[PDB]
Each structure stands twice: as structure tokens, then as C-alpha cells.
Chains A and B, each alone.
With several copies, the nearest count.
Chain A
Amino acid sequence: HLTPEEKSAVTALWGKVNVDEVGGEALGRLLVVYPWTQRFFESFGDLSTPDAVMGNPKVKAHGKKVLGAFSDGLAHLDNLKGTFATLSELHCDKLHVDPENFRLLGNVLVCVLAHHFGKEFTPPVQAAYQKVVAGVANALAHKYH
């Protein structure tokens, strides 16, 4: 439950986010830091080295879709279970992704936002974003519940 102060600070920082790169950077880092998540992206190609994952064009293109889904959740915070209904069906019934990996990618996105904004990404701003990434991960796992 985000306070209007947290809500406003969340939209302000997100408006300055590089829509074209941040997503790919977050999906790329998840694949390098947590190397088991690579199983779900075998049809993507070279991931052998950390530079192969980051440089990969489909990791960037797929990350763009993932960021788009995150931006979707930020616009509709009070309806997360609904916003991610089809994706929760996709990731649980069709893809069989463990819900723990959603918590990891959400945290990796937080690390990326910190890496891009620096000291602008202050502790109360991270606290607000932790509510969002926990909310998205929980909503992406409702099909298991």
C-alpha cells in the first residue's frame, strides 16, 4: 500500500526511465546473476558469457516487453491481480516459471534503477519501488494460489 508521497515519487522517477534499455539490462542481469533462469530462454542464443547476455538483441527486445508490463502495473496499482491475469496464466500454466524468480527479477530491476539514477534513487524511493516489485511478483503468482 503506497502513500500518495510514495505514489508521486514512483511516477516521477519512472518518467525519466530509459524505456529502450532498462528492461533489457534487468532481464540480462537476472540471466547472469541467477544462471538457472537461462533454461526459459534457450531459443534466445548465446548466453555463455556475461557480455553475450547483455549484448543479445532478443534479451533487450524481451526486456522491453517485461518493462512495458511493469509500466502497466505502475499505472494500475490498485488492480495488480487483474493487470497481470494473462501473464500469471502464461508464467504458471504454459511456462512453469517458479514464483521465486519473479521476486528476483523485481529486485534486479531495483538494482538497475539504482545503477541508472545513482543518488537520485534514495532509500524512501527504493522502499516505494519494493512495494511495487513485491506487488507485481505476488500478482504474477496468483495462478498457483
Chain B
Amino acid sequence: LSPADKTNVKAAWGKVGAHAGEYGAEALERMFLSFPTTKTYFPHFDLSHGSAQVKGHGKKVADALTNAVAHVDDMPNALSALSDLHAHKLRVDPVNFKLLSHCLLVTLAAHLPAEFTPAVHASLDKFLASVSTVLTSKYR
């Protein structure tokens, strides 16, 4: 991650603002539709169109993401509480993090076209991958 990528990421998720909680909800929904095997990680959940469980969890993913962009120079310590849940408790396969980051990138491209430029895209994919790397590292 470069400071040029940091300026691209801050600007991109700076334009999402309040929509992030709904963007994360769409990105979540897209993952279950595109890659059904990911639904095993949600055994009780109701994963249908326009669900408060998906919308509420969408806000959780987006709030963790807004903290990550604000703490871009300190990600393993700021996301430490989440890195323990995803790696020790949930033990999510790192492939699923590539799948959600892809759907998140799809949602950003669909809602923000003037912002989703190849320079922003490359930085966003780098940001999400480093967020994924941090989230799926605290395990042994």
C-alpha cells in the first residue's frame, strides 16, 4: 500500500458516507447469490432480498471498513478485535475474503462510476486485500 493508494482510498469511501451501510448490505447479498457455498458461514441467517439481518450486518462490515480507512497506517491493532472473531472463532477461509472484496468492488462500481477509476480500483483492491490479510492472520 502506497500513500498515493491511501489518497485514492480516502477519497473513494469518502463519497459513500451514509450509503456504506446499504452498499455493504448489497455486497453481502451479492456474495450469497454469486457464490452459494459462502452461505454455510451463516447457518441461522435469513439471506433474502431486503432483510434487516443482512442490512444490519452490512452496517457492521461498513463501520469496520470506515475505521480501516481512518486507521490506514495502523490496521492490525485497530481491527484486532475483528481479527480474533474471523480467525479464532469463525475461522473463515481466506478465499471467502477474496469473494466478498470482489462483490464490494462490484457494488462500488455500480453505484459510484465517476469515482471507480482504474487508479481507484487498484488501490481499493489493495486496501480490501490488506484488510482481508489482517482479518485472516490472528490464527494458529
Please determine if A and B sit in direct contact within the complex, based on CB atoms under 8 angstroms apart. yes
Bound state CA distance, A49 and B109, in angstroms? 21
Q: Which of A32-68 contact B (CB under 8 A)?
A: 32-33, 35-39, 48-51, 53-54
CB pair B30–A33 under 8 Å, yes or no, is no
CB pair B105–A96 under 8 Å, yes or no, is no
**Contact partners of A100 in chain B: CB under 8 A:** 93, 95
Q: Does A127 lie at the interface of the complex (its beta carbon under 8 Å from any beta carbon of B)? A: yes
Known: A39-B91, A115-B113. A123 touches B140 (CB 8 A): no
Interface residues of chain A: helix, strand, loop or mixed (majority): helix
Known: A36-B136, A49-B140, A50-B140. A114 touches B121 (CB 8 A): no
Known: A29-B121, A36-B136, A50-B122. A110 touches B107 (CB 8 A): no
Taking the nearest CB of chain B, how far is it from the CB of A129, in angstroms? 8
Q: Does A73 lie at the interface of the complex (its beta carbon under 8 Å from any beta carbon of B)? A: no
Interface residues of chain B: helix, strand, loop or mixed (majority): helix
Q: Which of A99-116 contact B (CB under 8 A)?
A: 100-101, 107, 110-112, 114-116
A-B contact pairs, 23 of them (CB 8 A): A33-B125, A35-B139, A36-B93, A36-B136, A39-B91, A50-B117, A51-B119, A53-B118, A96-B40, A100-B95, A101-B93, A107-B102, A111-B106, A111-B121, A114-B106, A114-B109, A117-B110, A119-B111, A123-B29, A126-B30, A126-B103, A127-B30, A127-B34
Binding site for A on B (CB under 8 A): 26, 29-30, 33-35, 37, 40, 87, 90-96, 102-103, 105-107, 109-111, 113, 116-119, 121-122, 125, 136, 139-140
Binding site for B on A (CB under 8 A): 25, 28-29, 32-33, 35-39, 48-51, 53-54, 96, 98, 100-101, 107, 110-112, 114-119, 121, 123-124, 126-127, 130
Q: A33-B125, A37-B91, A127-B34 are in contact. List 15 more A-B contacts (CB 8 A).
A: A32-B118, A33-B118, A33-B121, A35-B122, A96-B37, A98-B96, A101-B93, A111-B116, A115-B109, A115-B116, A119-B111, A123-B26, A124-B33, A126-B33, A127-B30
